[PDB]
């Protein structure tokens, strides 16, 4: 019912987050030529044996994800209050939310035109087949695509988008966090900002939208778990480490 105006602080928080995102997410995907080249081997049959023996798309996707983790670390460091946390808690939050924030931020390149993540020309267009070529199974990819569509249909304003990513990162319910109270205080500040923003730009669906966004955060936890299970399997493949990156190995190891 009540639609309070955004406070000076809330406006500042949003401005900071938008700026942080603009500085850490390149919508032109101009750095992609620097990643190891994508290689797409003939695997129309979706053979797990062939996929694991080759992992043809893994070097490229590992680089893309590693690159993205670095950008997420930068984004996170710009989240108001994040610096107030101990280095220990910052690292715990980053490592635990990295893959989730990547899935969230990738919605910007995701397109419902053909259900793909398009980052420019055909070379940098990723579909389900490309992810299976990196060693993952439909058990993860299909729910992820479903997640991308659901998120895409929320038609989030960039303000809502960056707040959602910040809230995802600053979560007190991450295993290993030491000062859950401080983290919850920061998250509440961000959550209150989001709730206020939604009510200001969306008439009472304001309540429906916030609930839907929070549900996406729950969906991300499940996706995170499935990815971890599959990463474990992938790591068993001999010589897989060389196809990944040091950051990826640490974050998901
Ligand atoms: C990374 C990003 C992008 C796309 C994300 C994709 C498309 C390819 C397969 C991925 C990467 C999924 C995959 C299941 C994870 C695999 C990771 C390993 C191999 C380590 O298990 C998770 C998200 C999926 C492009 C762009 O929007 C941002 C980047 C440019 C601004 C964003 O930051």
Curated annotation (Swiss-Prot):
Impact reported for residue 136 to Q: In VDDR2A; loss of calcitriol receptor activity; no effect on interaction with RXRA; changed interaction with NCOR1; loss of interaction with NCOA1; no effect on sequence-specific DNA-binding
Motif 9aaTAD positions after renumbering to this chain: 246-253
Entry GO terms, CC: chromatin; cytosol; nucleoplasm; nucleus; receptor complex; RNA polymerase II transcription regulator complex
The NR LBD domain, residue ranges: 9-253
One record GO biological process: apoptotic process involved in mammary gland involution
Keyword Cytoplasm (UniProt): yes
Residues engaged in binding calcitriol: 25, 68, 105, 109, 136, 227
Keyword annotations from UniProtKB, A to Z: Cytoplasm, Disease variant, DNA-binding, Metal-binding, Nucleus, Receptor, Transcription, Transcription regulation, Ubl conjugation, Zinc, Zinc-finger
Outcome recorded upon mutating residue 105 to L: In VDDR2A; loss of calcitriol receptor activity; decreased affinity for calcitriol by a factor of 1000; no effect on interaction with RXRA; changed interaction with NCOR1; loss of interaction with NCOA1; no effect on sequence-specific DNA-binding
PTM comment text: Ubiquitinated by UBR5, leading to its degradation: UBR5 specifically recognizes and binds ligand-bound VDR when it is not associated with coactivators (NCOAs). In presence of NCOAs, the UBR5-degron is not accessible, preventing its ubiquitination and degradation.
Domain of life: Eukaryota
Subcellular location: Nucleus; Cytoplasm
Gene Ontology MF terms in the entry: bile acid nuclear receptor activity; calcitriol binding; DNA binding; DNA-binding transcription factor activity, RNA polymerase II-specific; lithocholic acid binding; nuclear receptor activity; nuclear retinoid X receptor binding; nuclear steroid receptor activity
Region span, Interaction with coactivator LXXLL motif: 77-95
Similarity comment: family membership: Belongs to the nuclear hormone receptor family. NR1 subfamily.
Quaternary state and interactors: Homodimer in the absence of bound vitamin D3. Heterodimer with RXRA after vitamin D3 binding. Interacts with MED1, NCOA1, NCOA2, NCOA3 and NCOA6 coactivators, leading to a strong increase of transcription of target genes. Interacts with the corepressor NCOR1. Interacts with SNW1. Interacts with IRX4, the interaction does not affect its transactivation activity. Interacts with CRY1. Interacts with CRY2 in a ligand-dependent manner.
UniProt free text on domains: Composed of three domains: a modulating N-terminal domain, a DNA-binding domain and a C-terminal ligand-binding domain.
Disease: Rickets vitamin D-dependent 2A: A disorder of vitamin D metabolism resulting in severe rickets, hypocalcemia and secondary hyperparathyroidism. Most patients have total alopecia in addition to rickets.
Record function comment: Nuclear receptor for calcitriol, the active form of vitamin D3 which mediates the action of this vitamin on cells. Enters the nucleus upon vitamin D3 binding where it forms heterodimers with the retinoid X receptor/RXR. The VDR-RXR heterodimers bind to specific response elements on DNA and activate the transcription of vitamin D3-responsive target genes. Plays a central role in calcium homeostasis. Also functions as a receptor for the secondary bile acid lithocholic acid (LCA) and its metabolites.
Entry protein name: Vitamin D3 receptor
Species this chain originates from: Homo sapiens (Human)
Gene assigned in the entry: VDR
Span of the entire protein shown here: 119 to 423 of 427
């Amino acid at each position: 019912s009540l639609r309070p105006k955004l406070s000076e602080e809330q406006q500042r928080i949003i401005a900071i987050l938008l700026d942080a995102h603009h500085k850490t997410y390149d919508p032109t995907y101009s750095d992609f030529c620097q990643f190891r080249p994508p290689v797409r081997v003939n695997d129309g049959g979706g053979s797990v044996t062939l996929e694991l023996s080759q992992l043809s798309m893994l070097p490229h996707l590992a680089d893309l994800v590693s690159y993205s983790i670095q950008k997420v670390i930068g984004f996170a460091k710009m989240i108001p209050g994040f610096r107030d946390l101990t280095s220990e808690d910052q690292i715990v939050l980053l490592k635990s939310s990295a893959i989730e924030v990547i899935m969230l931020r990738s919605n910007e390149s995701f397109t419902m035109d053909d259900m793909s993540w398009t980052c420019g020309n055909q070379d940098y267009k990723y579909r389900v087949s490309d992810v299976t070529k990196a060693g993952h199974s439909l058990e993860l990819i299909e729910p992820l695509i479903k997640f991308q569509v659901g998120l895409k249909k929320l038609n989030l304003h960039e303000e809502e988008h960056v707040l959602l990513m910040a809230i995802c990162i600053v979560s007190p319910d991450r295993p290993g966090v030491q000062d859950a109270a401080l983290i919850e205080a920061i998250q509440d500040r961000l959550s209150n900002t989001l709730q206020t923003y939604i009510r200001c730009r969306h008439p009472p669906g304001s309540h429906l939208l916030y609930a839907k966004m929070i549900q996406k955060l729950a969906d991300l936890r499940s996706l995170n778990e499935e990815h971890s299970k599959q990463y474990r399997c992938l790591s068993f493949q001999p010589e897989c480490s060389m196809k990944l990156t040091p950051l990826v190995l640490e974050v998901f190891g």
